Amino acid sequence: SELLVNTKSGKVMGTRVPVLSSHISAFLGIPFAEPPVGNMRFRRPEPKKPWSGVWNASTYPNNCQQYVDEQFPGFSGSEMWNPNREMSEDCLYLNIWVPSPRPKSTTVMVWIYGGGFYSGSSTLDVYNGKYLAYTEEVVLVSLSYRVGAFGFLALHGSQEAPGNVGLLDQRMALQWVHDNIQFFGGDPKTVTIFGESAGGASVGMHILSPGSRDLFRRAILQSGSPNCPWASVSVAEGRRRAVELGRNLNCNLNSDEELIHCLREKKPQELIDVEWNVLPFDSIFRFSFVPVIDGEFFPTSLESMLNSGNFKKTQILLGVNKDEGSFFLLYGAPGFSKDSESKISREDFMSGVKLSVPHANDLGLDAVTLQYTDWMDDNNGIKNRDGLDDIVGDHNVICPLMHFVNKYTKFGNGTYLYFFNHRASNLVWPEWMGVIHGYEIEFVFGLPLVKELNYTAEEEALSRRIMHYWATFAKTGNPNEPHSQESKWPLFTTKEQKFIDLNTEPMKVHQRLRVQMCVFWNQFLPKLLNATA
Numbered sequence: 030s031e032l033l034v035n036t037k038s039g040k041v042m043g044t045r046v047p048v049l050s051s052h053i054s055a056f057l058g059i060p061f062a063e064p065p066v067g068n069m070r071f072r073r074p075e076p077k078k079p080w081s082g083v084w085n086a087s088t089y090p091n092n093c094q095q096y097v098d099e100q101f102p103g104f105s106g107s108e109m110w111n112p113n114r115e116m117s118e119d120c121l122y123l124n125i126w127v128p129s130p131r132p133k134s135t136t137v138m139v140w141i142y143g144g145g146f147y148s149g150s151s152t153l154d155v156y157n158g159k160y161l162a163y164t165e166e167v168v169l170v171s172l173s174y175r176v177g178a179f180g181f182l183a184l185h186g187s188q189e190a191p192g193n194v195g196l197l198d199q200r201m202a203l204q205w206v207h208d209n210i211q212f213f214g215g216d217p218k219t220v221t222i223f224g225e226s227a228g229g230a231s232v233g234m235h236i237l238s239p240g241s242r243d244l245f246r247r248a249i250l251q252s253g254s255p256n257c258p259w260a261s262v263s264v265a266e267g268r269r270r271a272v273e274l275g276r277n278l279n280c281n282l283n284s285d286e287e288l289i290h291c292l293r294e295k296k297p298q299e300l301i302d303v304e305w306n307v308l309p310f311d312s313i314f315r316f317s318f319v320p321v322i323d324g325e326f327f328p329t330s331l332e333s334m335l336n337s338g339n340f341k342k343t344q345i346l347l348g349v350n351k352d353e354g355s356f357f358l359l360y361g362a363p364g365f366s367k368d369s370e371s372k373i374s375r376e377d378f379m380s381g382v383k384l385s386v387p388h389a390n391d392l393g394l395d396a397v398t399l400q401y402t403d404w405m406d407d408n409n410g411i412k413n414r415d416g417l418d419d420i421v422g423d424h425n426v427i428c429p430l431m432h433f434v435n436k437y438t439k440f441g442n443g444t445y446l447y448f449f450n451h452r453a454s455n456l457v458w459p460e461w462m463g464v465i466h467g468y469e470i471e472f473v474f475g476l477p478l479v480k481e482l483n484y485t486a487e488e489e490a491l492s493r494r495i496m497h498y499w500a501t502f503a504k505t506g507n508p509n510e511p512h513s514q515e516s517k518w519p520l521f522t523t524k525e526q527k528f529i530d531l532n533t534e535p536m537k538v539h540q541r542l543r544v545q546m547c548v549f550w551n552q553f554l555p556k557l558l559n560a561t562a
């Protein structure tokens with residue numbers, strides 16, 4: 030009976046599930062931490078006390094408490110990211126997908142979902158590991174971590190609400206997989222962590238954090254870097270927002286201990302309803318509770334760690350999508366609509382810019398406009414629309430990831446960069462939105478292979494190709510075949526900075542991803558902002 034496994038925590042009864050005219054084992058809801066409920070709220074996570082009897086891991090677990098997106102009711106496009114299980118503070122569980130027959134010492138891949146550190150679920154249809162597991166024969170694991178105030182509230186100095194506890198949950202999970210994935214046919218020495226958006230930043234933060242380095246082999250980052258503008262705040266800013274939440278719930282603000290009691294007596298929803306009120310500025314692509322540069326989990330500043338090489342050195346595979354900013358513009362920028370091509374007016378554009386670089390002074394905003402405005406056609410509604418897409422995209426995702434790539438590729442042991450620019454055939458979103466943030470995930474997980482999902486033959490091709498690169502990487506540290514005639518995915522180097530694009534057409538090798546616009550974001554602007562504040 031391959032559905033029965035004994036782990037250093039207890040026994041787990043899996044379940045045999047269908048996967049494209051075949052089957053594989055599935056262990057859903059394996060707990061790896063004690064319920065972070067009641068007194069535990071905001072505290073670090075403590076390990077799950079070994080359970081007696083046989084734990085039933087045959088159906089996905091509860092999701093963590095979070096904001097739910099109700100901007101476009103009954104619109105799968107947006108609702109596909111919403112929790113699809115009962116929200117609950119008790120949500121520290123993980124999922125395993127094992128091939129059949131159960132292999133031994135095979136490649137493991139742990140997925141870290143994204144969602145800006147404020148939302149997420151390891152049980153979305155798009156994160157079903159069965160396909161990947163089955164097709165490439167690897168033990169796919171999808172973990173979970175606390176999000177929102179519940180996983181990142183940061184009153185640095187306290188021991189009850191230190192912050193980064195969310196990142197800690199992902200660790201304990203990575204730990205558990207470490208001391209247990211073998212029983213499921215996994216090889217704890219060939220673990221590859223991969224996540225998108227906040228998940229990507231997470232992977233990269235584990236590459237930085239010393240207390241995580243020894244828990245995985247290589248790593249993959251999708252549309253998200255650890256040094257992202259939105260991926261973290263200073264202990265000061267975190268404490269401010271922490272107090273701010275309390276003030277928003279009529280809490281005793283005198284001492285940390287008082288504040289913590291108050292926030293612990295409030296119902297999950299009471300905290301969620303005012304979550305957004307703590308953000309310092311009116312803006313987009315910014316979230317309240319996120320990783321804090323504490324001095325522990327993160328030894329020193331991120332730029333300093335990257336510049337000195339103070340971080341796990343191994344092979345990494347990462348990339349971005351053609352239109353990282355469209356999603357966020359649609360939800361919080363003026364002029365945009367889901368029912369039209371959103372031609373943005375000049376007045377709206379200025380608005381949109383300020384909502385994208387909220388920390389920028391008036392001069393900084395001008396620098397941004399000049400940099401992204403065509404003065405030979407400034408009224409073109411289409412150019413302004415795309416302009417913002419690139420602005421939000423480059424500032425929040427591409428450029429940060431680019432900065433990281435380079436800084437990393439100076440101490441690492443191999444880098445593979447990609448440019449996902451394929452516009453799905455069944456996409457439910459408008460066309461101006463192009464290749465949307467986070468929409469490259471369905472291909473990494475092989476959802477196109479499903480015929481009922483109505484994907485074009487060529488898209489199943491791509492999905493299969495991507496899954497191979499990905500799994501192949503995890504297993505070998507290189508996405509290319511050992512010796513095939515297929516075109517190779519160049520290795521990214523400080524000198525040539527090559528990268529490929531991921532789409533249906535035949536591979537093309539490009540050089541210096543958005544190098545121009547990124548000099549602006551990584552050098553000039555910051556330099557300007559600092560000298561003029």
Ligand SMILES: CN(C)c1ccc(-c2sc3cc(O)ccc3[n+]2C)cc1
Pocket residue numbers: 098110305313314356357360361466
């Ligand atoms: C699915 N994606 C990418 C997404 C979904 C939702 C949001 C936001 S930003 C924001 C700001 C605010 O003050 C209130 C609500 C709110 N919501 C819901 C941003 C991106």
Ligand SMILES: *[C@@H]1O[C@H](CO)[C@@H](O)[C@H](O)[C@H]1NC(C)=O
Pocket residue numbers: 085087088
């Ligand atoms: C949990 O395992 C039991 C077997 O004892 C099974 O009958 C049940 O369907 C599983 N999940 C549920 C429905 O709670």
Ligand SMILES: *[C@@H]1O[C@H](CO)[C@@H](O)[C@H](O)[C@H]1NC(C)=O
Pocket residue numbers: 441442443
């Ligand atoms: C990785 O390390 C090995 C052995 O230490 C070395 O031979 C190889 O050149 C490195 N690969 C890259 C591309 O850095």
Ligand SMILES: *[C@H]1O[C@H](CO)[C@@H](O)[C@H](O)[C@H]1NC(C)=O
Pocket residue numbers: 481482483
């Ligand atoms: C593909 O998607 C639809 C959407 O629900 C599904 O019902 C059906 O199996 C497919 N559409 C058809 C019948 O062409």
Ligand SMILES: [Mg+2]
Pocket residue numbers: 290291294
């Ligand atoms: Mg009280």
Ligand SMILES: [Mg+2]
Pocket residue numbers: 351352415418419463
């Ligand atoms: Mg664009």
